[PDB]
Design a protein around this nucleic acid. Structure first.
Ligand SMILES: [Mg+2]
Ligand SMILES: [Mg+2]
Ligand SMILES: [Mg+2]
Lengths: 43, 683
RNA sequence: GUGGCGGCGACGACCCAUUCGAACGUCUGCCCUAUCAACUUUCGAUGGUAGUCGCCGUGCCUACCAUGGUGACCACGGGUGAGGGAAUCAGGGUUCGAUUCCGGAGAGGGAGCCUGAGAAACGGCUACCACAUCCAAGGAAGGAGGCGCGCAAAUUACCCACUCCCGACCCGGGGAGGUAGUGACGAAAAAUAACAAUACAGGACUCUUUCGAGGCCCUGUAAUUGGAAUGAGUCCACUUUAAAUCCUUUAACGAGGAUCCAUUGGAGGGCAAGUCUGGUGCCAGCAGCCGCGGUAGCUCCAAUAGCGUAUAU
């Protein structure tokens, strides 16, 4: 600890998670649902 | 040596949690997550100043390290930081199955090693033991778990499932991580996954509560009026003090009959309030006190706070009060008998719940875990004396409703402020919403539709219901609120059976939906059916054993797991209507899955910014879905006069009644059937 | 031809003898104590017969018998610094020599038990008693010395090269055994210089209660001068040894203020525009790195790598 930052001493998919443009919340907000197999999308 | 910067957001999150006395959640991804716990534990020790943090480790079947000092030595027979961490830190190891042992004690940090085996019962019990600024760490070591995370974040609708059981609860767990305030996903290296959408705005708080301020005011103002003041000084939270004053107010009344009800769920101090209330009665002229519980071993904290109330206000350990212990191997260390002779002669005695006799000369009787005693037994313990009743949240409500109707004075007090941490914790609110362990206090009234004539049953889709969409979440909450409000006991695990268990179907009864309506129709009745036999449960096995019938067991039929009607609408006939619609459906009178991802296509999928694939509808008409042909229908329930009349009217015929009653409810399980083989069984 | 004969070794094996022993006897001989004169039969003391046990002889033990046994020629009883001895070999300037031999017992405390030629085991086990450690609380595993003196490192390190021992073995192993550290209690030997020359002065030295009496082949000078010698130290290489250190050899550097600088105790001399005290105007005592301004290494005596003080005597 230097009072400013921290100093401490499969993978290709992990790299894909880091470079994600849209957050899962914004992905979730744009989602819509339909009821009774035909209706106005509630989302 | 070359060193890597760690993003300050990790340190910012930890420091804010300790200062706010609120826990935070960490989700490590990768097979090297064990080394991540070592770094996260050490950073927690730097922020915390009270003590060296304690670590709770939970695993399902296999632990990589030995956890035995001699054994881990010979396995090694150059230096690993993980080996230092295990030997230095105080770690308590517990199993997923054996999680009941760690219920009472408190730990600084909790580690959930195995993600795929997570169950609602495990989550509620382990997270509760975390205190203050501690960390809850969840690991995703398996490659299957990693790619499930990959598919959801790439496209919210598409999901990956191998081959059996869908496991929607794990997917629902993944989606809910975004909503949580204090959630930080990290990798094998100290790298944050930017998916919660709130991690970007995390900032350090600048360097005490409204409820805590009031308690200090009470602790100063109640020095004037005492010995009620001494017990409040022993109290830790505000809402505990208010219950204490309510108990002593009931004690001082010049009435034979008076009831104070303590209505506090887990995590909030409940036995402590009872213990101080007993000491307050001992402080007064009360002589004969009885304490009732299903087991003497259950009440140990209650007698502790009686001693703390005793120790605070004279009552030396030997010169004033003498305690007689269990002196038995079974139910050991329980203090059944407490005798205090400072003020004339006063005695506190523990008795079995089935001891309506020996209560002839009673002034105060305290009933704890009152829900856990059979219902008829509670009535016998009422009597003409003062009674203290404490029941944990999460019928007993019918009894207190009768007490509101009455003679016996009623006082209702509830606890909402947790002892271990500060109110308003983000982890707790997220945890309860995920498990649906909370019910809305007030339910809006709606118009009553005509009963046996104009309601049609609908088929709820399991896949669409558990998706985290806002409309689906409200509908699931409405169903679950009615699902647990029935006479059936509520358990957090039942949500997993709705979500994961196969051969389970959900049907809901609705009012006639107008062409122009709101987002969600009101639900009147919810019914669950599990298919058995040719299409291995209680109904097939018990009949086969008892009646030694060979041809039976090749028949196909389902049992009604649960049937529910809204309490305001109860007793007017939605329940009978739903059963009739099932029979026409399964007899064939009515004229007759979300996109899965291939194993090799998990990497091939790219980002879809706006979802495109059409989702399966939430509710389906009975005509649209084809029906399976069922020979019979069954139900298993604890035999009660109210339910027996209901099922006989619907055509269900008893075949079996269990010899020994259930321990908790005192009811005999009964099996009924409806369709010439039934004639043989009935005779 | 399911012919017949054969060499040199290894291992095991009944019995006899031998070697190494071990165990019971015979004879001879122990210190002080009589203010211990009697003792033994106080769960056998002496002897006889039969038997048990034991490797064997035997009151060693058990049954049945006799009344025996020892004693002033000291029985019996009690004692006894019973670290100290005892021996051995070798030796010219008196020996600061060397080595060896033991009386038993125990392995947290008393009993029981297992192997072998040899142990009632320097080692396992069971029960009881006493301690203490780990745990998910269910169960599991165990048998010595340092300081208290301003003071805790050998409580270690290297090797089987010597001497010898054990093993299937020429070879392996041995904290048996061998090698290596500090040190004014003390004892012994020894440096810190030696040899020449020049210049300039005129006074040494003994005795002596202030006068004096003797006397000279030299003395003094913090004077100058010269080129020979050497070890304190610094630093190569052999030899040594299981490896290395040490001792003995030995290459090269290493002195004029030779500053490459000996101490401890005792007794004296020298002083200002300086301070204090007391007086006998100008004095005396004590003392003096301190003054007006300025801050960039005197002499003599005793012992000598040794020499004082205090107390008791
Ligand atoms: Mg000397
Ligand atoms: Mg001369
Ligand atoms: Mg010269």
């Amino acid at each position: 600890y230097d009072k400013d930052a921290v100093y401490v001493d499969t993978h290709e998919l992990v790299q894909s998670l880091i470079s994600t443009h849209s957050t899962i919340d914004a992905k979730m907000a744009s989602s819509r649902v339909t009821l009774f197999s035909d209706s106005k999308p509630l989302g | 040596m070359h060193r890597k910067k760690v993003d300050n957001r990790i340190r910012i999150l930890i420091e804010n949690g300790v200062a706010e006395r609120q826990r935070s959640l960490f989700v490590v991804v990768g097979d090297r997550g064990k080394d991540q716990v070592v770094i996260l534990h050490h950073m927690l020790s730097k922020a915390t100043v009270k003590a060296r943090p304690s670590v709770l480790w939970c695993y399902k079947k296999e632990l990589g390290f030995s956890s035995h000092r001699k054994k881990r030595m010979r396995q090694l027979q150059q230096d690993d930081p993980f080996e230092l961490f295990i030997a230095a830190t105080n770690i308590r190891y517990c199993y997923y199955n054996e999680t009941h042992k760690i219920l009472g004690n408190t730990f600084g940090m909790c580690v959930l090693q195995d993600f795929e085996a997570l169950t609602p019962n495990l989550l509620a019990r382990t997270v509760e033991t975390v205190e203050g600024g501690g960390l809850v760490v969840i690991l995703l070591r398996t490659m299957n778990s990693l790619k499930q995370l990959y598919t959801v974040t790439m496209d919210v609708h598409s999901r990956y499932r191998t081959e059996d059981v869908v496991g929607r609860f794990n997917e629902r767990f993944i989606l809910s991580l975004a909503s949580c305030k204090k959630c930080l996903v990290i990798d094998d290296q100290l790298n944050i996954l930017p998916i919660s959408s709130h991690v970007a705005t995390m900032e350090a708080l600048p360097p005490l509560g409204p409820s805590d301020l009031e308690l200090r005011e009470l602790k100063e103002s109640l020095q004037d009026t005492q010995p009620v003041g001494v017990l409040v000084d022993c109290c830790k939270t505000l809402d505990q003090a208010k219950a204490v004053l309510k108990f002593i107010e009931g004690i001082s009344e010049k009435t034979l009959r008076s009831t104070v009800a303590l209505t506090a769920a887990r995590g909030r101090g409940k036995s402590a309030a009872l213990g101080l209330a007993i000491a307050g009665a001992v402080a007064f002229g009360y002589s004969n006190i009885f304490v009732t519980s299903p087991s003497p071993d259950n009440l140990h904290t209650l007698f502790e706070f009686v001693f703390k109330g005793f120790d605070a206000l004279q009552y030396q350990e030997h010169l004033d009060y003498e305690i007689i212990q269990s002196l038995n191997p079974e139910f050991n260390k329980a203090v059944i008998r407490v005798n205090v002779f400072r003020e004339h002669r006063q005695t506190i005695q523990y008795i079995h719940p089935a001891d309506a006799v020996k209560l002839g000369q009673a002034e105060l009787v305290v009933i704890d875990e009152a829900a856990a005693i059979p219902l008829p037994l509670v009535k016998s313990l009422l009597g003409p004396y003062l009674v203290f009743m404490a029941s944990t949240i999460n019928l007993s409500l019918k009894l207190i409703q009768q007490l509101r109707q009455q003679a016996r004075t009623l006082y209702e007090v509830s606890l909402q402020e947790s002892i271990r941490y500060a109110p308003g914790d983000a982890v707790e609110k997220w945890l309860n919403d995920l498990l649906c362990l909370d019910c809305l206090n007030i339910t809006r009234i709606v118009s009553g539709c005509p009963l046996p004539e104009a309601c049609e049953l609908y088929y709820v889709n399991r896949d669409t219901l558990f998706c985290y969409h806002k409309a689906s979440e409200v509908f699931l909450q409405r169903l679950m609120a009615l699902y647990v409000a029935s006479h059936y006991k509520n358990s957090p695990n039942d949500l997993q059976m709705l979500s994961d268990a196969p051969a389970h179907h959900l049907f809901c009864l609705l009012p006639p939906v107008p062409p122009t309506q709101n987002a969600l129709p009101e639900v009147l009745a919810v019914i669950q059916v599990c298919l058995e036999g040719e299409i291995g449960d209680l109904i097939p096995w018990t009949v086969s054993e008892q009646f030694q019938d060979p041809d039976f067991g090749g028949l196909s039929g389902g049992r009604v797991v649960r049937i529910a009607v809204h309490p305001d609408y109860q007793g007017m006939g939605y329940g009978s209507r739903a059963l009739q619609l099932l029979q026409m459906y399964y007899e064939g009178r009515f004229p007759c899955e979300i996109h899965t991802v291939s194993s090799e296509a998990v990497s091939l999928l790219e980002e879809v910014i706006t979802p495109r694939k059409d989702l399966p509808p939430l509710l389906l008409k009975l005509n649209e879905r084809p029906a399976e042909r069922l020979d019979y229908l069954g139900v298993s329930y604890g035999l009660t006069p109210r339910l027996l009349k209901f099922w006989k009217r619907a055509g269900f015929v008893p075949v079996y009644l269990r010899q020994t009653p259930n321990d908790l409810t005192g009811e005999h399980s009964c099996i009924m059937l409806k369709t010439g083989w039934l004639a043989a069984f009935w005779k």
